[PDB]
Structures are given as structure tokens and as C-alpha cells.
Design an enzyme around this catalytic site. Structure first.
Site, PDB file in Angstrom:
ATOM      1  N   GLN A  82      10.562  59.947 -20.788  1.00 25.59           N
ATOM      2  CA  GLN A  82       9.704  61.127 -20.898  1.00 25.59           C
ATOM      3  C   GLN A  82      10.602  62.336 -21.143  1.00 25.59           C
ATOM      4  O   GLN A  82      11.473  62.631 -20.332  1.00 25.59           O
ATOM      5  CB  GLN A  82       8.839  61.347 -19.661  1.00 25.59           C
ATOM      6  CG  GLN A  82       7.801  62.445 -19.945  1.00 25.59           C
ATOM      7  CD  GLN A  82       7.041  62.901 -18.727  1.00 25.59           C
ATOM      8  OE1 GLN A  82       7.645  63.321 -17.727  1.00 25.59           O
ATOM      9  NE2 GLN A  82       5.706  62.867 -18.816  1.00 25.59           N
ATOM     10  N   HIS A  88       6.399  65.194 -23.147  1.00 27.60           N
ATOM     11  CA  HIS A  88       5.719  65.769 -21.995  1.00 27.60           C
ATOM     12  C   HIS A  88       4.938  67.003 -22.434  1.00 27.60           C
ATOM     13  O   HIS A  88       5.454  68.134 -22.438  1.00 27.60           O
ATOM     14  CB  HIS A  88       6.693  66.136 -20.887  1.00 27.60           C
ATOM     15  CG  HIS A  88       6.028  66.342 -19.574  1.00 27.60           C
ATOM     16  ND1 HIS A  88       4.681  66.634 -19.457  1.00 27.60           N
ATOM     17  CD2 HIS A  88       6.529  66.261 -18.321  1.00 27.60           C
ATOM     18  CE1 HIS A  88       4.394  66.702 -18.167  1.00 27.60           C
ATOM     19  NE2 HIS A  88       5.496  66.494 -17.456  1.00 27.60           N
ATOM     20  N   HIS A 122       0.889  69.231 -17.733  1.00 30.92           N
ATOM     21  CA  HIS A 122       1.279  69.756 -16.416  1.00 30.92           C
ATOM     22  C   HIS A 122       1.893  71.146 -16.434  1.00 30.92           C
ATOM     23  O   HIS A 122       2.656  71.513 -15.530  1.00 30.92           O
ATOM     24  CB  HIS A 122       2.194  68.767 -15.690  1.00 30.92           C
ATOM     25  CG  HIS A 122       1.547  67.438 -15.450  1.00 30.92           C
ATOM     26  ND1 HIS A 122       2.267  66.327 -15.088  1.00 30.92           N
ATOM     27  CD2 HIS A 122       0.252  67.039 -15.524  1.00 30.92           C
ATOM     28  CE1 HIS A 122       1.440  65.305 -14.941  1.00 30.92           C
ATOM     29  NE2 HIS A 122       0.209  65.705 -15.205  1.00 30.92           N
ATOM     30  N   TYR A 151       4.083  72.493 -18.516  1.00 34.10           N
ATOM     31  CA  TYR A 151       5.450  72.657 -19.062  1.00 34.10           C
ATOM     32  C   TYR A 151       5.371  73.245 -20.492  1.00 34.10           C
ATOM     33  O   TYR A 151       4.298  73.722 -20.900  1.00 34.10           O
ATOM     34  CB  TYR A 151       6.274  71.372 -18.899  1.00 34.10           C
ATOM     35  CG  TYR A 151       6.400  71.051 -17.430  1.00 34.10           C
ATOM     36  CD1 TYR A 151       7.115  71.893 -16.573  1.00 34.10           C
ATOM     37  CD2 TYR A 151       5.741  69.952 -16.883  1.00 34.10           C
ATOM     38  CE1 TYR A 151       7.187  71.623 -15.213  1.00 34.10           C
ATOM     39  CE2 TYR A 151       5.807  69.687 -15.529  1.00 34.10           C
ATOM     40  CZ  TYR A 151       6.524  70.524 -14.692  1.00 34.10           C
ATOM     41  OH  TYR A 151       6.568  70.234 -13.351  1.00 34.10           O
ATOM     42  N   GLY A 204       1.616  56.238 -10.252  1.00 27.23           N
ATOM     43  CA  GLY A 204       2.743  57.050  -9.824  1.00 27.23           C
ATOM     44  C   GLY A 204       3.192  56.675  -8.421  1.00 27.23           C
ATOM     45  O   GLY A 204       4.152  55.894  -8.241  1.00 27.23           O
ATOM     46  N   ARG A 205       2.496  57.184  -7.413  1.00 29.71           N
ATOM     47  CA  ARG A 205       2.956  56.993  -6.034  1.00 29.71           C
ATOM     48  C   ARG A 205       2.995  55.523  -5.616  1.00 29.71           C
ATOM     49  O   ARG A 205       3.909  55.121  -4.885  1.00 29.71           O
ATOM     50  CB  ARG A 205       2.136  57.867  -5.091  1.00 29.71           C
ATOM     51  CG  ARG A 205       2.439  59.351  -5.294  1.00 29.71           C
ATOM     52  CD  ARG A 205       1.385  60.262  -4.693  1.00 29.71           C
ATOM     53  NE  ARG A 205       0.132  60.174  -5.432  1.00 29.71           N
ATOM     54  CZ  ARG A 205      -0.988  60.837  -5.118  1.00 29.71           C
ATOM     55  NH1 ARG A 205      -1.029  61.646  -4.064  1.00 29.71           N
ATOM     56  NH2 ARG A 205      -2.075  60.708  -5.864  1.00 29.71           N
TER      57      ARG A 205
HETATM   58  C1  LIG Z   1       6.891  62.854  -6.850  1.00 29.90           C
HETATM   59  C2  LIG Z   1       6.138  62.965  -8.154  1.00 29.90           C
HETATM   60  C3  LIG Z   1       6.820  63.250  -9.340  1.00 29.90           C
HETATM   61  C4  LIG Z   1       6.148  63.348 -10.557  1.00 29.90           C
HETATM   62  N1  LIG Z   1       6.858  63.600 -11.705  1.00 29.90           N
HETATM   63  C5  LIG Z   1       6.226  63.592 -12.910  1.00 29.90           C
HETATM   64  C6  LIG Z   1       6.955  63.692 -14.105  1.00 29.90           C
HETATM   65  O1  LIG Z   1       8.230  63.692 -14.149  1.00 29.90           O
HETATM   66  N2  LIG Z   1       6.232  63.712 -15.263  1.00 29.90           N
HETATM   67  C7  LIG Z   1       4.860  63.660 -15.304  1.00 29.90           C
HETATM   68  O2  LIG Z   1       4.284  63.705 -16.420  1.00 29.90           O
HETATM   69  N3  LIG Z   1       4.164  63.513 -14.163  1.00 29.90           N
HETATM   70  C8  LIG Z   1       4.820  63.445 -12.998  1.00 29.90           C
HETATM   71  N4  LIG Z   1       4.067  63.278 -11.835  1.00 29.90           N
HETATM   72  C9  LIG Z   1       2.665  62.861 -11.870  1.00 29.90           C
HETATM   73  C10 LIG Z   1       2.579  61.330 -11.861  1.00 29.90           C
HETATM   74  O3  LIG Z   1       3.092  60.738 -13.103  1.00 29.90           O
HETATM   75  C11 LIG Z   1       1.114  60.886 -11.721  1.00 29.90           C
HETATM   76  O4  LIG Z   1       0.369  61.315 -12.889  1.00 29.90           O
HETATM   77  C12 LIG Z   1       0.488  61.452 -10.415  1.00 29.90           C
HETATM   78  O5  LIG Z   1       1.361  61.163  -9.311  1.00 29.90           O
HETATM   79  C13 LIG Z   1      -0.942  60.937 -10.135  1.00 29.90           C
HETATM   80  O6  LIG Z   1      -0.944  59.490 -10.188  1.00 29.90           O
HETATM   81  P1  LIG Z   1      -0.894  58.591  -8.841  1.00 29.90           P
HETATM   82  O7  LIG Z   1      -2.196  58.908  -8.114  1.00 29.90           O
HETATM   83  O8  LIG Z   1      -0.841  57.183  -9.421  1.00 29.90           O
HETATM   84  O9  LIG Z   1       0.378  59.002  -8.112  1.00 29.90           O
HETATM   85  C14 LIG Z   1       4.756  63.117 -10.604  1.00 29.90           C
HETATM   86  C15 LIG Z   1       4.079  62.852  -9.404  1.00 29.90           C
HETATM   87  C16 LIG Z   1       4.762  62.763  -8.202  1.00 29.90           C
HETATM   88  C17 LIG Z   1       3.994  62.478  -6.935  1.00 29.90           C
END
Ligand SMILES: Cc1cc2nc3c(=O)[nH]c(=O)nc-3n(C[C@H](O)[C@H](O)[C@H](O)COP(=O)(O)O)c2cc1C
Length: 362
Positions: free
Chosen positions: A98, A179, A182, A184, A321-322
Site C-alpha cells: 500500500q 492509498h 482515510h 490522506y 484488519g484487527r
Molecule cells: C492499527 C491499525 C492500523 C491501520 N492502518 C491502515 C493503513 O496503513 N492503511 C489503511 O488503508 N487502513 C489502515 N487501517 C484500517 C484497516 O485496514 C481496516 O480498514 C480497519 O481496521 C477496519 O477493519 P477491521 O474491522 O477488519 O479492523 C488500520 C487500522 C488499524 C486498527
């Protein structure tokens, strides 16, 4: 169940539809924003994912907004990522990088020359970013008011994305994810809330999308359209960036434009962690009829929701993600209906191996 069936994602074939979302973990070396063997181990542990999408990675030093986030602009970064992708490939995985520019979600103390970060307009993000304190620990700090990019700086930004893609291809990534979400830099141009420009890069939706489409065209030309994905968060508000008063129509315009390029995938980040209104099925249908690559959904998904939407023919894959932070073998756990490891949020951001490479498999 369809989650454990293969999917063609542009140039590569994923063996399942359970993807690792991009996750900023802020464990890179400074000086140099260099990926590490520890990061390599973390990704290798997760190689059974249909596709790993890396943490957000700088296209340039100016792109940096977070202390500990890696780059893909220097020779030393290229060398370090080469080892990481080799490790993932040795475990029969696939990994996308990414690529971001943080724009105004940044701080002058980590910019080249200590200068204000750049954006579409000179408007503070009114949020925080993550820096490091004197002991190297992550700390949240208010964002610095940005400088609006001059018109004659825009080609340089496009070139930085192009160059980072050349570097990513060399570094052994299978795909690149732009990206564009969010809040950016790319999203700062897309959104009327953050873009008050009155030149060809602001105003109309065509002008607001101009930068991201120039970037898409440049990176498709550098590599191949079937190597390029894009992440958007075009419905709702993310890190204080809303999508303006015509968010649905503007999203569909962008998606129809992306479709013309024949890119590998469209990755929709549907909500932030605090949640919000779900996508309407009508909106999902409008997206689906306009885009002919893979659609990845993300944002507090469950396996059951993913199966439902895949079965309805509306998305092709889900990014977690998490659950991926905490479950290196998430694919096996979802396949077997096993419990998921307890998450430890205090170690999501910064630090070392603890809360990073110490979550067990089944
Ligand atoms: C600790 C953390 C770091 C994240 N970093 C990024 C990132 O680098 N790029 C991005 O597009 N989203 C990032 N996100 C969002 C996640 O990719 C994901 O869309 C979000 O956590 C919701 O999905 P989940 O419910 O499966 O965690 C991040 C989320 C968390 C919690």
C-alpha cells in the site's frame, strides 16, 4: 461457502478470499524509515492470506506523516523490502504494497527540512498523527497546518507515485494498492471539505479526481493495469475528511473512470472504527455494474457478512484488519470455525515483537 475458493486478482491468483487489510504498525527503523526482519517475520506468519496488503508505505520522504512508517523511495528501503517479499513468497504467499502520501496528516518535525507538510489547500487536518518520543515510543501529536501544493508541483507528486511503483515492482511485491482513502493526500484532493482549490485540481468532481486518475494512469504505464489496486473510503467521514454533499454520485464518477483503466481491484473501506451507516445494497449494485475488476470490502466485517455479499454477487473478497493483527492463521480459523485470539490494542502502534509476532496459530 465461497470464502475458501480462489479468485483472480489482476495478474495473480489468490487461493481464498480472506485478505489481510493494510495495517500501520509503526515499527520501522529511524533514521531511514527502513523495514525490518521483525516486520518480515510478521508478514511471513500471515502468508496463508489470499492476499496480504502491507502497511501504508511512503512514496517519498515528503510523503511521511508517521514516525515508524516505512518508505519505498530509498535504496536501503528497497533492499529491506526485497527480503520481506522473498520471505512471504517462500511461504507461498502474495503481497501487495500500500503506497501513500500522508499530505496534511503529518507534522513538520518529520518533514524534509522541518517544513510544513503539503496538501490540496492550506487547511489543518484538525486531527493527530503518531510521532516518537525521546525513547522511541509512539505518541499522538496534533497535525501541522499544511502548505497548498503549487500547480507546478503536481507533476512531481505523480512522478513520486510512479517511481515508488517502479521500486515496488523491483522489491518483489505482487501488486500495488494506491492509498486513496482515510483523509490522506489523494483523498484530500477528492474531498470538497479539504480541497478549496480553484485551479484544474479543485472545484468540480472531475477536477477533484484529476490527481488520483493521473496517478492511476502513471502507475499503470509504469507497470501494468493488472498490477494496480486502489483503496477508497468514499462514503462517510474518515479522520475528519467527509466526502462532500454529493458523495454517492462523486464516488460513482470516480469508479466509472477507474473501470476504464482495467485495474486489478477496487478496495472499499466502508467505515472507520467508530462505525456508521452501512452501505445501501442499491449503492453496492451501482458500484458493481460500473466496475469489472475485483471488489474488496472492509470495515468491521464478519466472515458471515462477507459470504452474504459474495453470494449476492456484490463483492469478491473481504479484508480483515484487527482480526489479522491477532490471528496469523485467520484463514484456517475461519475455515474451521475456531475461536479468534484476544486482541491487545495497546501494542497495535509502535514497540517491538510483543503484540506483533507473538500471537499464536491454532
Ligand atoms: C492499527 C491499525 C492500523 C491501520 N492502518 C491502515 C493503513 O496503513 N492503511 C489503511 O488503508 N487502513 C489502515 N487501517 C484500517 C484497516 O485496514 C481496516 O480498514 C480497519 O481496521 C477496519 O477493519 P477491521 O474491522 O477488519 O479492523 C488500520 C487500522 C488499524 C486498527
Amino acid at each position: 461457502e465461497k470464502l475458501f475458493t480462489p479468485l483472480k486478482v489482476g495478474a495473480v491468483t489468490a487461493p481464498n478470499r480472506v485478505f489481510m487489510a493494510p495495517l500501520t504498525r509503526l515499527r520501522s527503523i529511524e533514521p531511514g524509515d527502513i523495514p525490518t526482519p521483525l516486520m518480515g517475520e510478521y508478514y511471513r506468519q500471515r502468508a496463508s492470506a489470499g492476499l496480504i496488503i502491507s502497511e501504508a508505505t511512503q512514496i517519498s520522504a515528503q510523503a511521511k506523516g508517521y514516525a515508524g512508517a516505512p518508505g519505498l523511495h530509498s535504496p536501503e528501503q528497497i533492499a529491506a523490502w526485497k527480503k520481506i517479499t522473498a520471505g512471504v513468497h517462500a511461504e507461498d504467499g502474495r503481497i501487495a504494497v500500500q503506497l501513500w502520501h500522508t499530505g496534511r496528516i503529518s507534522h513538520s518535525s518529520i518533514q524534509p527540512g522541518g517544513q510544513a507538510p503539503v496538501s490540496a489547500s492550506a487547511l489543518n487536518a484538525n486531527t493527530r498523527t503518531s510521532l516518537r518520543d525521546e525513547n522511541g515510543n509512539a505518541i499522538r501529536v496534533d497535525t501541522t497546518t499544511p502548505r497548498a501544493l503549487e500547480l507546478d508541483e503536481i507533476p512531481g507528486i505523480v512522478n513520486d507515485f510512479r517511481q515508488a511503483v517502479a521500486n515496488a515492482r523491483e522489491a518483489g511485491f505482487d501488486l500495488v494498492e494506491l492509498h486513496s482513502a482515510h483523509g490522506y493526500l489523494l483523498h484530500q484532493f477528492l474531498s470538497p471539505s479539504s480541497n478549496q482549490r480553484t485551479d484544474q485540481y479543485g472545484g468540480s468532481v472531475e477536477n477533484r479526481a484529476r490527481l488520483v486518475l493521473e496517478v492511476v494512469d502513471a502507475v499503470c504505464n509504469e507497470w501494468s493495469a493488472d498490477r494496480i489496486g486502489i483503496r477508497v473510503s468514499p462514503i462517510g467521514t474518515f479522520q475528519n475528511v467527509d466526502n462532500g454533499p454529493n458523495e454517492e454520485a462523486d464516488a460513482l464518477y470516480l469508479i466509472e473512470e477507474l473501470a476504464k483503466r482495467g485495474i486489478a481491484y477496487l478496495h472499499m473501506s466502508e467505515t472507520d472504527l467508530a462505525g456508521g451507516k452501512p452501505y445501501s445494497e442499491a449503492f453496492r449494485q451501482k458500484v458493481r455494474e460500473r466496475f469489472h475488476g475485483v471488489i474488496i470490502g472492509a470495515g468491521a466485517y464478519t466472515a458471515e457478512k462477507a459470504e452474504d455479499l459474495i453470494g449476492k454477487g456484490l463483492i469478491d473478497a473481504v479484508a480483515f484488519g484487527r482480526d489479522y493483527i491477532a490471528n496469523p492463521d485467520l484463514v484456517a480459523r475461519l475455515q474451521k470455525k475456531a475461536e479468534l485470539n484476544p486482541q491487545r490494542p495497546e501494542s497495535f502502534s509502535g514497540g517491538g515483537a510483543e503484540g506483533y509476532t507473538d500471537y499464536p496459530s491454532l
